Ligand binder design. Structure first.
Ligand code: K
Ligand code: K
Lengths: 355, 355, 355, 355
């Protein structure tokens, strides 16, 4: 709610071309199809192949900035990004070679930051997952066994064995309800009463495991990326020690591209930003274009008014952002600091229009 | 649990009439129907049309308070609120013109505050949603592919292609269980074991994304709307800086309409209010009707007793509200403040009955 | 994890007898049944009727403690607890009179504390629920309409009208998957991709609304019930103002009945209690039976050892409870207080065995 | 995200062998099977039987450390781990004796720490569960009754009685959608609209009950296990009282086995550890092998740089772990402490390479 994400966060064409590349698959998978577009898109693989392959060798030029780097991740596919189709092209003479379009699916995951964020936490909380994962199997076979006891007599064809019911079990436990084969008696139908009660409590916990410290990590993502852009602010020599932990939880940074709008005039002033790198277009008669290491919005927030400028992205700017309360927190947190933002709230009343 | 919401929060008839207006649709959609009520409700569209249209031009009189306003949102439908049926009335000569009753559905969303609250946060956290949204597709086709490997032999008619299984996949992944076409073999049925395990963990996270900072926003909704009604209280010059952030998280304001009841006598005193605008009916022999900028409940809370008055809404009052703990927090937070609420807790023992 | 709930929390037989009373229904609902037990349980209604009716008049003796009371809730059924079957007995001469066994279902909800806890919060957060409830209908008909566009041609019998699909919609949206009538084409099947994506995000929020401040209320239930039993402790004149809010969030009270065990000896000391009313059986050679207003466990927690006594419920005791960290919080929170619990941790080393 | 779990957390073979032991079952459960492997795995039960039985008597040697112990839990199966198959072997002469392979399922739960963690909290919050569990049945039969009212006429065969619909009810309420027997009329289909609305709100709460204080318990698991390994650190005489509660919430300990890697060099420094027992392989020209009671990472964190050593597990080490913010919290929390970690951040610049 307090951030302006722009400049094509899904930027790199390396990620873009996996998407059309795999829709290339399906038309090959279908009878009653003409050969015309059949191979037209076979080329498109050769394009994306050739294209990533065109990108490839420039990546293999890893002499740029070659001081200390750990590029096993960023390379682990790019190797396979071209080889796996290649040997697939020959040894799989039949059209099924395209079945090695299981390969580009990681290419989005190449530059999927937020995916290392995923795997990072599993190596802390999987302890829980295992004991639950067992417990899933505990509650599975403990209960999945229960049905073989009963309908083996009159449902051999469906419940004539154990795993036939373990099938029904997880479908019965995992919120699913397929609806192929269901009992007929009372006591077997009695059993289900605790099952949905269970599985929704189980994944009531188990799925809860993920978001639990995942949120910690992403709420931690809002700090680890953002204990940076701190000393750049010339004013933050005076902030207290615990002051930042209270603050930086909320603070997120994003980039805005040149030409875009930052805060349009007259729309309700709901947030203030800290510039640390780039430049702006503060729409005034004398444009107060502030470069790396500035801010604005106190004009609107201390007053609680609309915007005093159609501030717009003159350049590519590394932005921060902040709503009132957490700045009211700052105005509360220090008399020494609100003095200047009082002055700024008078300086930029005159300085916005003047030079 | 600590708020009295009254005065028709679903107030404006602009929102009310979208509801009956669209039930007007369905009777047209049905064979074996008489023409009698068929067109009777066609008029009702003309009513709601004419009615919003009656409202419309008065809205187009936007010279009232025409100083600085951003009414592209509040107008974006009202334009289309009447034009889309209109051209639909002619060009779609067949009865299907009513299919442009997809239009009024936004009219509730016109004055749906809490909907800008919705869209506000998506422009901070969609970063997550995308990488997850991809990851959904990652886990989709990574796994959805897996079934074409197998039952193409003996289920051409169901699993004779890729997307036929991507269909089954999301139904298999998204907690659904339709139950049209399901495998027959072991290994394909083996695969499902991790699927519900996945999809409930995925949306275990992904759906968790929404409520995560949505709650922040609505818990922030309880401040941004309520850093107002602060200086109106004549006592809040002395409150400490961080004191408010601890408090205003809990504080919610709502309005009560005239004539209604506020706290009935003898029912258990569980909360105290801060009046800031309006007037009351404090049921005493001498009614202590306190106007803008007052409070009551300390009589009951410091004692932990029932109510001392059938306090009732004499007028339309802008109310706040507060339970004990967060007022016990206040009584704890300052000796300078509990002195007066001690006095008030003796003044209103005599002043409630006296003048 | 830090509480000992005992003494039959499902105590009152008023609640107990609704359970067997309604199983009395079903045997009447079934052909091929003998009249023998058919009416045997008809009497059991007359028993529970007669029994609650036996209880009833003693309740109508509401002169006990008749000073200030609000018993419209506790009486609202007891009136109907006997009248509704009664007039049902005659006017519904056919056996269907028992269909007014919809009545006792509230009798558990008579003395269901935690049910007023339920309804309390809905009158603060239903504001959200409505705008979501609308939004549910927004997203309902916005999308439910989408299918009538398509398969009306070749599925008149299933998708020949609007509400036929609104049916499929919520089943398609609400995580359900019945599996009666499903499309056949591509684009209609394309549509579902955002639906489960939606409904799990919708109730990802909407169901999240309940637990959100419900947890606040139950976490508030742990205070509002427990700002009591505070001044009874003779030591809590010295606790700091904000000290309690940090503490009482964790503190829960429950009752234990006479004869039961409180903490068995030698089992791992994981918690300490504050007695405020009742008496105990501290299993020592000289039983240190401490009455209203005492505690124990510091012997085990400061040492981190097993229990020093099979402390057991001599009488019906109003207990509190507390784990280490929040007592380590206390030992941290004040040097003035750990002095005595140091002394107590030496006094009860000698006093436990001695007198 | 801040922990290195290693050394086979699923260590004990007592737990390992329940897994293969129960797959031994299913082949017996299947017609058209040869007797060859039929009894080959019957032996494997005798192995696991004999094996746990081999383990058994050594466990019955409970004279080791026989001072004060509560081993009713750890023994409650080991007794039955061998007896239940045994009497099953004879009295159940038919092959169905293996149906007492319901027995080993608890053997993983023998040494399933995190399972006592499970049951611990249910004896605090089941109060809620009951009133909800009733409320489930309230909302069950309140609504489950509703359908018998209607389709008894034209669906005797499906809805000719009460429990036939209670079946459909929970399937209709518990997110399931089996799809065997569904109504045909309007008003009965009207009813479902509030049902999924209900059941997802019910388990929206009820399943929420588990994770609620379960997370408290596991977030408490991160303290109760970790108020230990505190005084071992020679520096923690000076930490403030409330300082730890702020910290130890985040701190988790795990073990790493000998030979493994701890932090590889050049990978991004994202965390620092506190050693308290064991030894390491700090990869330097002069290995700075620090034993029980040490730490490292401040070299990387105060600088925000990669690792200065391929620190690797020379021995089995009891580790702690910590990311920056919570150490930045420490560097913030005390000037007296950052002095030494400044010195250490200069000492280990020279001491890492030197002796
Ligand atoms: K389902
Ligand atoms: K189904």
């Amino acid at each position: 709610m307090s951030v302006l994400p722009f400049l094509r966060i899904y930027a790199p064409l390396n990620a873009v071309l996996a998407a059309p590349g795999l829709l290339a698959v399906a038309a090959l998978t279908i009878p009653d199809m003409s050969g015309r577009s059949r191979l037209a898109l076979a080329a498109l693989l050769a394009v994306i192949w050739g294209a990533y392959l065109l990108q490839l060798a420039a990546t293999l030029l890893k002499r740029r900035a070659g001081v200390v780097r750990d590029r096993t991740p960023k390379i682990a596919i790019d190797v396979l990004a071209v080889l796996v189709p290649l040997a697939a092209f020959l040894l799989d003479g039949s059209p099924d070679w395209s079945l090695y379009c299981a390969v580009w699916l990681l290419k989005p995951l190449r530059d999927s930051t937020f995916f290392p964020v995923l795997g990072r936490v599993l190596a802390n909380e999987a302890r829980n997952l295992i004991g639950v994962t067992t417990l899933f199997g505990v509650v599975l076979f403990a209960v999945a066994l229960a049905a073989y006891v009963i309908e083996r007599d009159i449902q051999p064809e469906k419940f004539g064995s154990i795993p036939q019911a373990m099938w029904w079990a997880v479908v019965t436990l995992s919120t699913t309800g397929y609806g192929d084969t269901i009992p007929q008696s009372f006591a077997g139908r009695v059993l289900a009463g605790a099952v949905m009660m269970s599985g929704i409590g189980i994944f009531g916990l188990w799925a809860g495991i993920l978001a639990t410290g995942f949120y910690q990590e992403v709420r931690r993502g809002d700090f680890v990326r953002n204990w940076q852009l701190v000393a750049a602010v010339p004013l933050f020599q005076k902030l207290g020690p615990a002051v930042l932990v209270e603050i930086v939880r909320a603070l997120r940074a994003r980039t805005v591209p040149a030409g875009a709008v930052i805060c349009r005039i007259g729309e309700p002033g709901d947030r203030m930003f800290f510039v640390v790198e780039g430049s702006v277009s503060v729409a005034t008669p004398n444009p107060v274009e502030l470069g790396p290491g500035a801010f604005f919005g106190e004009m609107a927030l201390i007053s609680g008014e609309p915007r005093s400028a159609t501030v717009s992205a003159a350049t590519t700017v590394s932005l921060l952002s902040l709503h009132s309360a957490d700045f009211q927190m700052l105005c509360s947190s220090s008399p020494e600091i609100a003095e200047i933002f009082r002055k700024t709230a008078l300086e930029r009343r005159g300085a916005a229009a003047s030079a």
